[PDB]
Design a protein around this ligand. Structure first.
Ligand SMILES: [Hg+2]
Ligand SMILES: [Zn+2]
Length: 257
């Protein structure tokens, strides 16, 4: 199946998922000089105070921190969004070296990693129904750069040891996602898709301008995970990012002057 290697990586995805070459694929390069400030965007609202994390899973492509989304707890709203989107999981994409790993780019600059907080539109009732709609998802994207440590990330970092290989999971309750947010909520927004197969075009992307800093030691532990399952030949989990795709007929809007 799909992966990030030479025989099954992003250049191969289109054969099983033809939408890979579609009209609103993600990620994209964010050209700051073409993006336009949009005075019509309402303030963004990130309400994660009642968030309930449940588990962490190595799914063979990245690791997912999963949240109880059976009630309106952790929600994203305002900004370009209409209605309420509920947090279902977060995950990251990173590189083998600090000069690469993010999916979106900013004037071609690649960050060391990128965090995705995935949310689904509550008017569609469940995630699986939301991903059959053009406005079913909202993903909050946050860049990571290497510098000082991010305190809020350490509990994540500490448990990776226990989910080294594909298919392993650990209990991961009471984690507070607010500790992964930067100070500013200034963002760029555009309509796009999920960046892993099946690459569904159901997402309103909200990419924060301000990156968070994580330590070299923290990112280094991400690089010790495995894409393979227990007992198989070790293939480090690194470079699990899709590169920038064609912007096509899309405009990127800025929330800030
Ligand atoms: Hg996978
Ligand atoms: Zn992602």
């Amino acid at each position: 199946h799909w992966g990030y290697g030479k025989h099954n990586g992003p250049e191969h995805w289109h054969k099983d998922f033809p939408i890979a070459k579609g009209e609103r694929q993600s990620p994209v390069d964010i050209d700051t000089h073409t993006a336009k400030y949009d005075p019509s965007l309402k303030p963004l609202s990130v309400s994660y105070d009642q968030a309930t994390s449940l588990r962490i899973l190595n799914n063979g492509h990245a690791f997912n921190v999963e949240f109880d989304d059976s009630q309106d707890k952790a929600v994203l709203k305002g900004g370009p969004l209409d209605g309420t989107y509920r947090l279902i999981q977060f995950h990251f994409h990173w590189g083998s070296l600090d000069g690469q790993g993010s999916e979106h780019t900013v004037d071609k600059k690649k960050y060391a990693a990128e965090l995705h907080l995935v949310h689904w539109n509550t008017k569609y009732g469940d995630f699986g129904k939301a991903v059959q709609q053009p406005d079913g998802l909202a993903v909050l994207g946050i860049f990571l750069k290497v510098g000082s440590a991010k305190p809020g990330l350490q509990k994540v970092v500490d448990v990776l040891d226990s989910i080294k290989t594909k298919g392993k999971s650990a209990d991961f309750t009471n984690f507070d996602p607010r500790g992964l947010l930067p100070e500013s909520l200034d963002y760029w927004t555009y309509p796009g898709s999920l960046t892993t197969p099946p690459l569904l075009e159901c997402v309103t992307w909200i990419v924060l301008k301000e990156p968070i800093s994580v330590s070299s030691e923290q990112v280094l532990k991400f690089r010790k995970l495995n894409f393979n399952g227990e007992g198989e030949p070790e293939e480090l989990m690194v470079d699990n990012w899709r590169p920038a795709q064609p912007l096509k007929n899309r405009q990127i809007k800025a929330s800030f002057k």
